[PDB]
Design a protein around this ligand. Structure first.
Ligand code: HEM
Ligand code: HEM
Ligand code: HEM
Lengths: 727, 309, 727, 83
């Protein structure tokens, strides 16, 4: 045949295009000129296709790939069909075990560069010079669900970064909240068992809203801090581009003089912090369970590269015990009001992978993979993680040679006396496979530690204690950080936390677990406890009403850096606006709308009651991106309704529903000319309302008003009004 | 200790109860008196819990299952903590590869019995006497999505039955529509690749609504029949109890005299045929991605046993 | 540091050197200028060592590769030691499952070239042009034992050849005998279980001399033909360089016009056929269980490259039923007297691998791997093999991407829609992973069958019959081929067959199995059966004595091509002679001996009672290779004793034993001057005897005589005399 | 785990303890034991925290390491006493 069309419409343009303009494709075909040392080094295993003959894996050309070999055209298939058997066998063996946690994830390639040399505090080569660029590979993920679960669940998110440094791979394997649920790695199977689907029936997926999770939390108050972050809007990010990242544990930075400095790692999203609202997130898991995966991929194809600032909280070794919390306790955060985040460098994700399985699914990150200039601490959760990644990757990725899988390979040299193992790629020519050896003059050889290019030596921390299985008494405080978090949130963020706990505990079948969680909230803050209790039909006791609130954290009664929205940081580039078309669109409005959006890097999606095209007043042919039902308001940041023949869409139920949903979800809406007739559906004032942009036409200040609302993300003042709308 | 409440409300009643009345539980605890030969034969590997000491896998009692062994209560974790290492090791290796297709599925135990002896057309032992009961294990599934994807997607459903007969295991591995998309098994990897998530970005999950599926369909008209069924409300069943089942292929029955009879296998839902509507099914993928799994489980806990002829 | 010596004696010369002259080494270091297309394409995975730092697999330099990280120098090891954990983990996972059969094997690289274009009979591209060179990788093996078992056991040998052709990989997976034990693949697990170590105790290794094997054989007379070959000296080859190879099955050759020709594949050893004798092979299993592996590696390092001529027996389609046996029956051979072997091309093995595990142990051959121009037949052993190799290789090599392990990769192009699988190396950029597709204009595309570069199409053989599990009546004849083999053997080869059966059946514990085997031998030949029975204390019945011998094969009462030795083909290049020195060797004799050996490509190993050196009469310092006991006569082809101070070695028990062993095992012996005193230890007459070269000095005709004996391999006329020697 | 195929090698007959073994570990390739415990974690109230930890004691007690005193720096160094 064949039938790719004559117009060449099958193939997407190899240039940045806005979401939905062209079919997506493998990164190296979408952006062939985007390169980095790692992307180039993968060239040996990239496999093309065009102009090549179809063959078996042994290189034999196939003549007929449509039929098995049989004795007669209606006869039995013959065992000698080696073509069919290789093809079916490889298909039969396609799947590998998904990760134990973080199985649902989306990744991209990029690069990192420090703003200045950090040689006074660390000898890490990748932070030693502002013009030294280090390729990275980043994988973002949910945490509980399987690899086929949905993106916009309520859950913690993983944020893992593989740095291909000149002195080794450093993996920074963090999450989107600055603490973890538990204190010691020994409890990790217990916690993860409690949050994952229950064992009898394997329900629920991607949800902590079930009895065993809340049983565990209620019995293990150390979890309450991260639970508070998960119940807030932090648990439902708008995009991986708009959430923070944290390494959680205190690590060490080691300089050339041997000085150790404690450090906690942060990633700041340069697109700003932004989250969905629960009803929107939950409905989006049904409308588009691949929303975050798609959003990341389309941002990079559009040139809206995710950018993050690496930042360090630095504490001198002499200040280890100066806080009212233990620095080694992963359930405690270090307030930025106490220890500021120093900016360190920028990370840009600018290329999607070519093959998700080969590059994303087989990537292996490990917090153990550190480099000279970095070291660990005794945090008891970090200590046990050091054992687990290595162990799980051998079974997940089939053997001990997972570092030879292309995405995992260092770009710098690697030489040692390790040999064999399943799927061994490297063919070693060294005469010796042991050291010391004389037969190869002891090569490859050990290298002493030094200021640069030196071997790894651990910091010589003094260890003094008996061999004990004991929690440090300093870790036995569970309510002051949850309280600090609570008081740092805005009133509307506090309401959403309450709503999250209420919704989750309403799904817990055993009422006494609900009551025990409420009792724990009474140890954090009474207003919080009472608001959740009222939603659960629970009444606090007199004793509960008199629980003394936990102490402030080093005199802090709040830290605004813990809130998503108290300090504006809203950027609109990369956001999307739905434009609800009609069959006689006033092109003056459309011109003005698209020009204003284009100027700020905001994308548009043209919607209608059907697919195809509609023609504007002026004759302009407009292509329809999707239908009102086909691409609901859940997927956009704002909605504009231009003037024209509004009767065409005024009696359309889907069109009205579109605005009711967007209104409920606090998204800015802009109506021009006769589009103002839609105000009745969303029942608000004859004279108007903050959050609803309206004018006779879409001109000068109309688009400016709409853009200012989008920079603020959502219209929080509309909260009290949304409860009367049936949406 | 003593974390359970003194009114015993942690434990669900061991008697049929309506959906939502009691917490769900393992079948043998919820219905200890429901038995069959296969269920009885699994007793040798069933492991209890109550009143036993917590141990390693080698039988060593654990004293402190809350902490790793370290040098000092704020010190480094020690390599000799064999208890931590067994526990983390087993956790680290919990997962196995999901099924290539039909990775999302929900299953139950039951039994079969023929209405009358079918010896005139087949010598299969399990079809030879109305009083002969055959334990079964049935797994229903979606077809495209992974094991963690949602139940009420638009897709073909699998309906697989393992009959534990006295002359061997017979597995009847069918779907909820009477035909399949393709004609020759050589094309199965092509079709499946086309319907599954696209390879550059692995989207979309649980959906045939993407370009590669329709490209393949457009190029292979043999697919149109099953496509018609999938696009109908057949592709969004109300429950596994309310859909039909088919073996699809023509098989043979062979009687004692050696006569072969062509046969196609069917399962009729005794609860009747019933499907959702698209907007409902898609929204239900978001509000309860485990809706069919939950519905199956709770119907059985309530005594509303799924029955098929 | 500095472990290597200053004289550079740790490093072997990168030039051809005789066995034992230099330490052996990886092939690319030993022979860097030897190349072929496959060796060159492996360069991307070869890893060096000299002048590089020692690192983890992630690229981090190691400073101390001698110690674990601990709390205090006498303290507990710390979980955070990621360097120790990676190194120990990779060691812990070094082994993979051995092959189910042919686990013990030795391999080398080389090349093949046809003598002329065979386009008239086959369109296979690698046989299309005399100038077309095809790289090969060949693995020879025993069949029963584990990878750690001994080389010189009595067993069939595997001979597998991977051809890296321009139109795909062609694997020719043969054995050193022209038939197999069984007729249908369904019984392979039964046969292999019977031959392998018994299941209760896992004894015996590398031996078919145990009850279950002979039980099976006695019950399944189809096995008798191959058992005859295995009991002959064919089951104990001198080296892989001196055995034959066969494809066994009838396959097909397909030309451009579509004509099918039946073909059986053969390999002829250009060094000639040669085998050990049983006592020598058994003792060598103890002294040097790696004898064949060492002999192959050392021959290539010396430039004595193994050479084999590929040959075809061709039968026209219309002659399928012209013989007394079925061409599809793999327990039947095609006598060369009926169908000559046509010479096709030459194969030369000229480079050893770099890493045994990576290249040899992970190599995967499959008889299924054919190319356009070749096809299968209905042989029911071959048919079942087509299924098995695919299946076993996935578990053995870890997944469905074993074709990406370097040694298995094709050198020609390979492109298809297969994806994923554990350890996926290739990163596919095709936008499509299915066909037919329009999104990549249907590439990679199928190719029609044609005269060259065409897609594979099976020959359209007519199939007619019911679906049955039934053996063809034509295969139900079991004794005529065993009888033809027996009658084709020399008298001393016949005696060795008798002795094989007798030794093996003496180790069968259940006497009735021995008796049943003797009864089977009575159906093949009465002389054979009575000679085995007399060694077992079994007396044939009158009925056994009157069993009619089976018919001749197509009129043939013998075929000399079935004998190892009936038609001389002895070459001496590559063979070794032990020279037994004394403390005052006569230099004149040594000069002449070495020069004559050197001129024919025969190696020498200078032996003495101790290591070090000895000084010859004229001051020549003579380096000692090994001692009389450290390098027994088992390892050499002949023994020369030069003149000098014979008293120094005449009272040496080890020296005398050296000659008694060599004598017993039929090796040529040459004694010069006072060395003739050793004649009494081997009880040879005063006058002399054929096979013992003697003179006053070692020159003119003495070396010619010895080399003439070496060309005839062993001294068969001395068999009657070796019985009286206590050795 | 790689030699014997997964983390349930303790269920291979020759390796099995003859004494009781109960805990919250689940799944893994070739899982033989079918756990009926409502809970797969601890602490839990839904099975009244069983199976439960046991204090160390004279007999039938839980395992507790001997409280050896550790005092030193983190070092990759051979004791001089071993030289
Ligand atoms: C501060 C606490 C933790 C953080 C921030 C964290 C973060 C993550 C992330 C982001 C991933 C996915 C990396 C990827 O995208 O492939 C991951 C995977 C994983 N984590 Fe951790 N995790 C933490 C605690 C733990 C603990 C305590 C353990 C066990 C002791 C653990 C065991 C695992 C395992 C087994 C995997 C799967 C790795 C693989 O298959 O390649 N995690 N974790
Ligand atoms: C009439 C057409 C087909 C039907 C009705 C069918 C039905 C099913 C069902 C219901 C399952 C899941 C069983 C379970 O619940 O575990 C399944 C699994 C599977 N199907 Fe089929 N299928 C069909 C065609 C095919 C074809 C043509 C192939 C390949 C040649 C194939 C390969 C597989 C594989 C590899 C699995 C996973 C099995 C496992 O991992 O246990 N299917 N199929
Ligand atoms: C004419 C009869 C046969 C011949 C000449 C033959 C020859 C060989 C040889 C030479 C090897 C080792 C290849 C290497 O060096 O890696 C081998 C391996 C093997 N053979 Fe065959 N064999 C025969 C019959 C069979 C049959 C009938 C079966 C099964 C139905 C079979 C199954 C195997 C398997 C499973 C392996 C191991 C393959 C691997 O792990 O890569 N063989 N055979």
């Amino acid at each position: 045949d064949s039938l790719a069309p004559e117009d060449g419409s099958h193939r997407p343009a190899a240039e940045p295009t806005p979401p939905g303009a062209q079919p997506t494709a493998p990164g190296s075909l979408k952006a062939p000129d985007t390169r980095n040392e790692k992307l180039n080094s993968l060239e040996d295993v990239r496999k093309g296709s065009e102009n090549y003959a179809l063959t078996t894996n042994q290189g034999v050309r196939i003549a007929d790939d449509q039929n098995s070999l049989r004795a007669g055209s209606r006869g039995p298939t013959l065992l000698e069909d080696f073509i069919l058997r290789e093809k079916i066998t490889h298909f039969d063996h396609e799947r590998i075990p998904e990760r134990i946690v973080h199985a649902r994830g989306s990744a991209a390639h990029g690069y990192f560069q420090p703003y200045k040399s950090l040689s006074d505090i660390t000898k890490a080569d990748f932070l030693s010079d502002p013009n030294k660029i280090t390729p990275v590979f980043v994988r973002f993920s949910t945490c509980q669900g399987g690899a086929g679960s949905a993106d916009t669940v309520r859950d913690i998110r993983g944020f893992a970064t593989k740095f291909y440094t000149e002195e080794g791979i450093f993996d920074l394997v963090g999450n989107n909240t600055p603490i973890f649920f538990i204190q010691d790695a020994h409890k990790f199977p217990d916690f993860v068992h409690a949050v994952k689907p229950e064992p009898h029936w394997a329900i629920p997926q991607g949800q902590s809203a079930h009895d065993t999770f809340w049983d565990y939390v209620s019995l293990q108050p150390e979890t309450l801090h991260n639970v508070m972050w998960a119940m807030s809007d932090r648990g439902i990010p708008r995009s991986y581009r708009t959430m923070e990242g944290f390494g959680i544990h205190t690590f060490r930075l080691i300089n050339a003089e041997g000085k150790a400095t404690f450090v906690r790692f942060h990633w700041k999203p340069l697109a700003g912090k932004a989250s969905l609202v629960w009803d929107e997130a939950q409905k989006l898991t049904g409308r588009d369970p691949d929303f975050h995966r798609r959003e990341l991929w389309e941002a990079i194809e559009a040139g809206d590269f995710p950018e993050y600032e690496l930042g360090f909280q630095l504490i001198p070794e002499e200040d280890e015990f100066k806080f009212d919390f233990d620095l080694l306790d992963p359930t405690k955060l270090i307030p930025e009001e106490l220890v500021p985040v120093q900016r360190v460098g920028k990370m840009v994700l600018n290329r999607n992978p070519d093959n998700f399985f080969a590059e994303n699914e087989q990537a292996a990150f490990h917090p153990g993979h550190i480099v000279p200039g970095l070291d660990f601490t005794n945090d008891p959760l970090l200590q046990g993680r050091l054992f687990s990644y290595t162990d799980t990757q051998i079974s997940r990725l089939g053997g001990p040679n997972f570092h030879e899988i292309p995405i995992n390979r260092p770009t710098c040299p690697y030489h040692n006396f390790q040999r064999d193992g399943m799927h061994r790629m490297g063919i070693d020519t060294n005469p010796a496979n042991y050291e010391p050896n004389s037969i190869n003059d002891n090569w490859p050889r050990e290298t002493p530690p030094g200021p640069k290019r030196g071997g790894f030596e651990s910091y010589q921390e003094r260890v003094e204690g008996n061999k004990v299985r004991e929690r440090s008494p300093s870790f036995g405080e569970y309510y002051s950080h949850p309280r600090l978090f609570w008081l740092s949130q805005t009133p509307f963020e506090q309401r959403h936390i309450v709503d999250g706990f209420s919704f989750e505990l309403s799904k817990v079948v055993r009422p006494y677990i609900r009551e025990r969680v409420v009792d724990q909230l009474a140890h954090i803050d009474l207003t919080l406890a009472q608001a959740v209790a009222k939603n659960l039909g629970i009444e606090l006791t007199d004793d509960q009403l008199n629980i003394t609130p936990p102490p402030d954290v080093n005199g802090l009664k709040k830290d605004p850096s813990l809130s998503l929205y108290a300090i504006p940081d809203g950027d609109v580039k990369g956001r999307v606006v739905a434009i609800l078309l009609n069959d006689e669109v006033r092109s003056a409005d459309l011109l003005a709308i698209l020009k204003a959006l284009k100027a700020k890097g905001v994308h548009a999606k043209l919607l209608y009651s059907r697919m195809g095209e509609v023609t504007a007043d002026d004759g302009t042919v407009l292509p329809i991106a999707a239908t009102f039902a086909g691409a609901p308001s859940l997927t956009v940041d704002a909605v504009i309704v231009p003037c024209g023949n509004i009767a065409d869409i005024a009696d359309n139920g889907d069109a009205n529903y579109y605005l009711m949903e967007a209104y409920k979800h606090l998204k800015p809406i802009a109506l021009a000319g006769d589009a103002r007739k839609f105000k009745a559906t969303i029942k608000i004032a004859d004279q108007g309302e903050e959050g609803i942009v309206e004018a006779d036409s879409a001109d000068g200040s109309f688009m400016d008003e709409l853009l200012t609302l989008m920079a603020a993300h959502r219209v929080w003042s509309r909260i009290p009004k949304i409860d009367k709308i049936p949406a």
